[PDB]
Write a protein that binds this ligand. Structure first.
Ligand SMILES: CCCCCCCCCCCCCCCCCC(=O)OC[C@H](COP(=O)([O-])OCC[N+](C)(C)C)OC(=O)CCCCCCCCCCCCCCCCC
Ligand SMILES: CCCCCCCCCCCCCCCCCC(=O)OC[C@H](COP(=O)([O-])OCC[N+](C)(C)C)OC(=O)CCCCCCCCCCCCCCCCC
Ligand SMILES: CCCCCCCCCCCCCCCCCC(=O)OC[C@H](COP(=O)(O)OCCN)OC(=O)CCCCCCCCCCCCCCCCC
Ligand SMILES: CCCCCCCCCCCCCCCCCC(=O)OC[C@H](COP(=O)(O)OCCN)OC(=O)CCCCCCCCCCCCCCCCC
Ligand SMILES: CCCCCCCCCCCCCCCCCC(=O)OC[C@H](COP(=O)(O)OCCN)OC(=O)CCCCCCCCCCCCCCCCC
Ligand SMILES: CCCCCCCCCCCCCCCCCC(=O)OC[C@H](COP(=O)(O)OCCN)OC(=O)CCCCCCCCCCCCCCCCC
Ligand SMILES: CCCCCCCCCCCCO[C@@H]1O[C@H](CO)[C@@H](O[C@H]2O[C@H](CO)[C@@H](O)[C@H](O)[C@H]2O)[C@H](O)[C@H]1O
Lengths: 98, 175, 70, 318, 106, 48, 98, 48, 83, 51, 57
């Protein structure tokens, strides 16, 4: 494959590792989730644009819209967590251990 | 060097990702993503995606990321720890840039590297199309077709956005 | 009186007038006294590239007419 | 040659902003039965220069910032984006001729909200941050109508090219077919730029409005220049959008003169409005957007999608 | 190239003005002074206006192609789906309005 | 007024698009020769 | 599809965007239209088990058009060889090519 | 071109700017604030 | 009726902005189906030639296909010139 | 099967509700003065706000 | 067939250079001024060129 794909695929891999390796802030992990979508948007757009797949030009928009809507849902849950505990730390979300 | 604009931008793209993926304070995490998004739009522009590129700025940066920063201020951070002042954050950041540097080193030197997939390092320009003389933008024509070809897509996408409004009001009411 | 407000408005007017006047004049200076060519679509760019080749001096704004026909 | 063109845009922009501060004080002065600056230079023509020198040699404020990087980034972003908004404007020819110039201007303005957010974050003050968040909520709310109104007008223009708005209005100003959209557009630009009666950042209802309160801020001059550059730019955009000037290719200067007058008059109307009305409450300007402008803007968007089709007046694509 | 030069010039000047705005006062050498996360508490209403902006802003993304969409031969389909989108945007507002999602009273 | 002007602009667009159509055969013939010459030239350097 | 409602009702919900050689706005063709057409027609009706063997030639050409992996390998060999000779002064670029 | 001359003219410039652009913070505590408000009012127009 | 007219009076007095919004939207949804010039929008969009008109191989029996662009046969744009 | 690593575990609430004891402090207290001291100047308003 | 396209074009322009050069030169010089090369800016010179070719060719 072309050289650009190497970096876009690295970016997805980096943000995926960032997503799976939490620290404390739930917010910092949501950003990694949005980073994953951004790299998917770019890789999809590059593949579609370069190949002149005309009708697929709308696909990156649908990706962005649905992922932003899912990000709104994630942010809403974070706010409800912050209301319960006063922080978005993931270590407070361990009640269901038992 | 301008003939490798796409590759240079994609290197900056990865560096920004290593930025927020090492997960500094959320305030600076949003900054890394904003820069990555802006660079990401730049890459899409250089493939002929002018409308798609500007959507990133309008919707991803001017919309989604504004709301992230808005929420971060209210619910998460008000002041940040100094970037790269933490052991794990700095170690993760150093590790990412070393991996990126070596990928870039071998791809440029051997003109090819191989990790899961085979990548060629001749230059992204070599794959471009050599025939263009229509009186319109193909990208714009494809996006405009959403309303003629994509009736079903509009319905489900429209329904999901409406349900999003309903769901988020349900979630946040608290009773 | 109210017309003593005009001198400051005149200064504003001259400042806002300059960018538009400069761009028009610089465009005609750089494109042989003609408007800078607009190429929003590949077809227009294709013809501009062809003119650059046809000119013989590597400038798309140098026009060759029937004098080149033979 | 292009580098000259850039400087012949940037420098006059900064000078217009400087002397708009004088015009505002004198226009507001005469509407208040007084004069305004007329001592520092003849007719106060040196007053902008005295203010500029004074501000730049003033001591920097205290307290210290919470984030040095965000403290420095906010003014750079505000001023960098403000100047960038001018590069596609056709006056009558643009510095950068974009096929999607209207979308570029929407996209760049939506990024201007970051300087508000970052300066609130860097203020090291809980109350100053809350003030910034109220300002952001106002800005993004009125961005919704600007985008939808803009989309409605372009259905008569046919493209996103700014210079195509000139061709669209060759026979007639778009304000005639679209005066209801022009009304809401003009108010949205006031609310978007935090101008009276929507200037709640400078109002009496903020948690930080108290005179004796302090928080990290500045430089004042750079933020002020960015704001006033946007006032002029929005009014230039308003003129192009609704009061299109005829362009003669052989006499472009005539376009520029007529186009400059219309922009000046619209800018003066911002000053006119500031002199005339009290200030909105925060909940009331939210109500104005969400419960008045937005329902009517959605309806007019439906109308302007349908109207060209049912009249057989769809504009060309190129 | 030109657009890159313009963006570089605009943000370069903005940067120089910012640093000299921060250095020029140090010429005065003013005297030393020697005299001076979590919820905010954040209101749910301010969060909900931001979220509503986002969801409305996503629906605007779908409406932006309308000027091009009107050039199609299938105008009846295009007009039906265009009005469908705007109406669902209105229905989102109506739902928010009638559940007091647009109120500022506590 | 907008309807009349946009109808005239549509007629003007058709005129511009038809000028292109009249010229496309000449442009196509040139492009084919240019492409084939460049490929032939690349081949000669490949042999060397 | 798991439930082929589209075929039963004869309604096209999403087939229109599944391949790049389907009808496009203004008849804009994708770059690999001919290759995809040939592979689809070769493999049509015979099932995927047979197609993986009997349409290998078509699929290999289609994949080469998509990602150009072999074209780039051949270009890289020529360019590598060329710069080797320019280093050794045993080759000179012609007037064109400069 | 002595340093005394340049320093002298630079003093005049910064002094001119500072006195020509005096921004007051009025601490209106009692009656005197009313007269301060009459200094801003049209007859005297301190803004001028 | 008269109950209906009274209701329209109460909203026109209390919510003129919403009355105007629903009226404008209602016209947007109704007038296109009633307009006689809607058909011309479709015709004009189909008269715009974005692509080259590829010629047909003349087998010898296509009477209604012109051999030259200025021959009488083929679709005319006479209706558009007058419109 | 109790172990040393689950000794601290306790059965969940009968109705799944855990008491809200973490952070609930939403009333701002604002020392309020006038935006401009030209007229009032000597007003101090200790206000407690809720949004 | 591509070569015959060129030869027909060359003979077409030789006809204009033979009978209608001056009206044609005026017409395309106006077209060339416009950044978009607009037909509608040059209807007066177009009419002069159209009249010439109708009479002489
Ligand atoms: C930085 C802080 C905020 C300022 C950013 C400004 C916007 C970025 C530039 C994008 C401009 C754009 O999309 O215009 C389309 C414009 C207009 O598109 P168009 O289609 O209208 O015109 C293109 C030319 N024709 C029509 C002939 C095909 O595109 C261009 O003018 C060409 C772009 C050339 C390639 C640009 C490469 C660099 C891209 C860098 C992006 C930003 C980097 C990230 C910065 C940090 C994060 C924000
Ligand atoms: C838009 C801002 C751009 C950047 C800043 C401006 C450019 C850089 C600085 C140069 C601008 C100079 C502005 C004009 C200064 C003249 C002021 C004036 O009007 O004087 C009237 C004054 C008027 O006297 P007055 O103030 O006492 O009058 C009192 C009021 N009346 C009369 C009504 C009763 O005359 C003077 O006394 C002169 C004062 C000193 C002026 C400064 C002299 C030095 C200038 C050269 C400095 C060299 C370094 C330059 C760098
Ligand atoms: C050639 C292609 C390669 C593709 C792979 C690309 C991705 C890997 C490159 C790195 C890119 C940067 C991504 C950084 C994400 C990990 C950072 C992180 O969030 O870790 C958090 C966690 C520590 O969390 P914390 O609570 O703060 O501290 C407790 C430790 N005492 O972390 C820790 O406990 C310490 C770990 C810090 C070091 C991170 C090393 C990278 C992660 C391992 C990836 C291995 C697989 C890569 C392939
Ligand atoms: C005003 C009545 C006279 C009409 C007029 O403005 O003069 C037109 C003149 C040239 O007309 P022109 O616009 O170039 O051609 C129209 C085809 N598009 O153009 C000119 O003479 C230059 C403009 C001078 C006249 C001012 C017209 C603009 C007035 C805008 C007022 C803004 C008011 C804002 C309202 C809100 C505040 C209350
Ligand atoms: C022929 C004549 C045709 C026109 C006749 C129209 C008939 C009247 C239409 C309905 C009028 C409004 C009904 C109403 O009762 O409005 C009052 C109420 C708002 O009152 P509110 O301020 O919220 O009260 C709170 C206490 N202070 O309203 C509400 O509380 C809820 C109202 C929500 C409305 C939001 C609509 C957004 C969309 C705008 C219209 C765009 C088109 C929508 C699609 C329709 C297509 C036909
Ligand atoms: C209710 C009032 C709606 C009236 C609609 C009447 C439609 C009449 C019709 O014939 O439909 C086609 C219409 C006219 O074209 P026509 O001349 O009939 O062509 C005949 C060829 N078979 O075609 C047209 O010219 C334009 C059709 C526009 C109709 C748009 C109707 C709105 C569709 C969106 C509804 C959204 C509802 C979403 C509600 C969500 C609730 C959660
Ligand atoms: C080359 C150009 C260099 C840049 C030069 C910039 C010069 C700036 C001169 C400003 C002249 C004074 O202009 C005036 O300033 C004050 C700020 O104190 C503003 O005052 C406004 O903002 C402040 C807060 O920021 C509020 O307390 C005040 O109630 C409100 O009215 C006025 O709205 C403005 O009209």
């Amino acid at each position: 494959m072309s050289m650009v794909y190497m970096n876009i695929m690295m970016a997805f891999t980096v943000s995926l590792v960032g997503l799976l390796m939490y620290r404390s802030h739930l917010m910092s992990s949501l950003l990694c989730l949005e980073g994953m979508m951004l790299s998917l948007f770019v890789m999809a757009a590059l593949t579609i644009l370069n190949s002149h797949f005309t009708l697929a030009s709308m696909m990156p928009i649908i990706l962005l819209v649905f992922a932003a809507c899912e990000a709104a849902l994630g942010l809403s849950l974070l706010v409800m967590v912050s209301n319960t505990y006063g922080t978005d730390y993931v270590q407070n979300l361990n009640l269901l251990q038992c | 060097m301008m003939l490798y604009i796409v590759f240079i931008l994609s290197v900056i793209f990865v560096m920004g990702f290593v930025g927020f993926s090492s997960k500094p304070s959320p305030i600076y995490g949003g900054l890394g993503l904003i820069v990555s998004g802006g660079v990401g739009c730049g890459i899409v522009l250089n493939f002929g995606g002018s409308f798609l590129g500007l959507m990133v700025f309008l919707i991803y940066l001017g919309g989604m990321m504004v709301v992230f920063g808005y929420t971060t201020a209210m619910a998460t951070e008000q002041y940040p720890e100094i970037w790269l002042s933490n052991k794990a954050v700095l170690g993760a950041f150093v590790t990412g840039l070393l991996m990126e540097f070596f990928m870039v080193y071998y791809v440029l030197k051997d003109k090819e590297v191989e990790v899961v997939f085979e990548f060629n390092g001749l230059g992204d320009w070599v794959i471009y199309d050599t025939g263009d003389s229509g009186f319109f933008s193909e990208e714009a024509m494809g996006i405009a077709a959403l309303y003629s070809y994509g009736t079903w897509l509009v319905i489900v996408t429209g329904w999901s956005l409406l349900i999003g409004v309903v769901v988020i009001m349900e979630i946040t009411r608290g009773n | 009186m109210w017309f003593e407000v005009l001198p400051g408005i005149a200064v504003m007017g001259v400042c806002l007038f300059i960018p538009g006047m400069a761009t028009a004049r610089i465009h005609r200076f750089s494109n042989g006294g003609k408007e800078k060519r607009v190429a929003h679509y590949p077809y227009q760019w294709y013809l501009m590239e062809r003119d650059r080749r046809v000119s013989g001096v590597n400038r798309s704004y140098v026009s060759k007419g029937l004098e080149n026909i033979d | 040659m292009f580098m000259i063109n850039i400087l012949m845009l940037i420098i006059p922009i900064l000078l217009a902003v400087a002397f708009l501060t004088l015009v505002e004080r004198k226009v507001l002065g005469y509407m208040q039965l007084r004069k305004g600056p007329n001592v520092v230079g003849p007719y106060g023509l040196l007053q902008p220069i005295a203010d500029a020198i004074k501000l730049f040699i003033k001591e920097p404020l205290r307290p210290a910032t919470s984030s040095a990087s965000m403290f420095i980034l906010a003014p750079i972003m505000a001023l960098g984006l403000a100047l960038t908004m001018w590069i596609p404007l056709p006056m009558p020819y643009p510095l950068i001729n974009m096929n999607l110039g209207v979308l570029f201007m929407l996209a760049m303005s939506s990024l201007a909200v970051y300087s508000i957010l970052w300066s609130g974050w860097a203020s090291n003050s809980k109350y100053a941050l809350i003030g910034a968040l109220r300002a952001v909520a106002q800005t993004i709310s009125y961005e919704v109508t600007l985008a939808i109104i803009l989309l409605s007008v372009l259905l008569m223009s046919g493209s996103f090219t700014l210079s195509t708005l000139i061709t669209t209005q060759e026979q007639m100003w778009l304000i005639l077919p679209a005066w209801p959209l022009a009304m809401m557009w003009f108010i949205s630009t006031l609310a978007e730029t935090n101008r009276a009666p929507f200037d709640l950042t400078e109002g009496e209802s903020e948690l930080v409005s108290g005179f004796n309160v302090e928080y990290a801020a500045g430089p004042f001059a750079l933020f002020f220049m960015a704001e006033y550059a946007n006032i002029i730019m929005m009014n230039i955009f308003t003129a192009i959008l609704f009061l299109g000037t005829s362009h003669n290719p052989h006499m472009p200067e005539l376009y520029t003169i007529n186009f400059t007058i219309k922009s000046l008059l619209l800018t003066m109307s911002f000053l006119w409005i500031r002199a005339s009305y009290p200030r909105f409450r925060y909940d009331q300007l939210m109500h104005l957007l969400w419960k008045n402008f937005l329902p009517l803007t959605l309806a007019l968007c439906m109308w302007h999608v349908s109207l060209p089709i049912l009249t057989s007046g769809i504009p060309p694509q190129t | 190239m030109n657009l890159m030069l313009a963006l570089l010039t605009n943000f370069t000047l903005a940067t120089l003005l910012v640093i000299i705005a921060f250095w020029l006062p140090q010429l005065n050498v003013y005297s030393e002074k020697t005299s001076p996360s979590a919820r905010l508490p954040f209101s749910m209403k301010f969060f909900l206006v931001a979220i509503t902006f986002l969801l409305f802003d996503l629906e605007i993304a779908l409406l932006l192609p309308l000027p091009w969409a009107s050039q199609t031969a299938n105008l009846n389909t295009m007009l039906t789906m265009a009005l469908f989108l705007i109406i669902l945007l209105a229905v989102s507002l109506a739902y928010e309005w009638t559940q007091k999602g647009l109120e500022w009273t506590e | 007024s907008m309807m009349k002007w946009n109808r005239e602009r549509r007629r003007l667009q058709i005129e511009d698009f038809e000028a292109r159509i009249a010229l496309m055969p000449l442009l196509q013939a040139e492009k084919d020769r240019r492409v084939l010459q460049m490929l032939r030239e690349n081949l000669e350097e490949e042999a060397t | 599809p798991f439930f082929d409602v589209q075929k039963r009702l004869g309604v096209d919900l999403d087939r229109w965007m599944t391949i790049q050689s389907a009808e496009q706005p203004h008849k804009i063709p994708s770059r690999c239209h001919a290759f995809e057409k040939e592979w689809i027609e070769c493999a049509h009706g015979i099932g995927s088990i047979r197609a993986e063997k009997e349409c290998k030639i078509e699929f290999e050409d289609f994949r080469e058009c998509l990602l150009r992996q072999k074209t780039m390998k051949r270009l890289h060999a020529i360019r590598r060889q060329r710069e080797k000779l320019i280093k050794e002064g045993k080759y000179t670029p012609p007037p064109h090519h400069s | 071109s002595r340093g005394e001359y340049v320093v002298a003219k630079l003093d005049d410039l910064i002094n001119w700017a500072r006195r020509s652009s005096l921004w007051p913070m009025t601490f209106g505590l009692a009656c005197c604030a009313v007269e301060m408000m009459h200094m801003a009012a049209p007859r005297y127009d301190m803004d001028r | 009726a008269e109950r209906v007219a009274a209701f329209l009076k109460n909203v026109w007095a209390k919510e003129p902005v919403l009355v105007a919004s629903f009226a404008i939207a209602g016209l947007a949804v109704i007038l296109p189906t009633l307009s006689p010039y809607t058909k011309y929008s479709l015709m004009i969009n189909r008269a715009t030639p974005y692509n080259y008109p590829v010629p047909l191989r003349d087998d010898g029996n296509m009477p209604d296909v012109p051999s030259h662009p200025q021959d009488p046969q083929g679709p005319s744009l006479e209706w558009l010139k007058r419109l | 099967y109790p172990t040393k690593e689950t000794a601290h575990w306790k059965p969940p609430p009968w109705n799944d509700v855990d008491p809200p004891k973490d952070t609930l402090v939403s009333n701002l207290t604002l020392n309020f003065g006038p935006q401009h001291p030209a007229a009032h100047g000597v007003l101090r308003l200790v206000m407690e706000l809720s949004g | 067939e591509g070569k015959l396209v060129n030869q027909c074009a060359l003979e077409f322009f030789r006809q204009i250079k033979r009978h209608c050069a001056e009206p044609f030169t005026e017409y395309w010089t106006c077209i060339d001024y416009s950044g978009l090369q607009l037909f509608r800016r040059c209807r007066k010179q177009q009419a002069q060129f159209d009249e010439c070719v109708l009479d002489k060719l």
